[PDB]
Amino acid sequence: MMFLRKVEGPRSVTLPDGSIMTRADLPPANTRRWVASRKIAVVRGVIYGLITLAEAKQTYGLSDEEFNSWVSALAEHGKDALKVTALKKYRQLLEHHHHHH
């Protein structure tokens, strides 16, 4: 089962403004203490780095409102609610990824 994203060598993803993080620092739903950086790392890590919210909800979904509260903290400006960086990208990307030339 191969994916369109050839990622393995990089090992770490870069968040829009949050440096690089690996697939090892991901809170495996359990975790111990969910701190701000810890929570924000989940939403940015799963959505921007690894998988879709389908898997991120089944694995890292914990409580749906809880997950929303992380995104809400990352939103700040909620007029459009779609202009949220992590969500806008996860939404816009589905409509034409790019075009390699």
Residue pair 46/38 in contact by the 8 Å Cβ criterion: no
Instruction: Write down the experimental method used for this entry.
Output: NMR
Domain extents in the chain: 11-94
In terms of Cα–Cα distance, which of 65, 60, 54, 58 is closest to 25? 60
Could you please state the CATH topology (level 3) that the domain comprising 11-94 is classified under. Answer: Arc Repressor Mutant, subunit A (1.10.10)
Decide: helix, strand or coil at residue 4: coil
Q: Rounded to 10 degrees, what is the CA torsion of 21, 23, 27, 33? A: -40
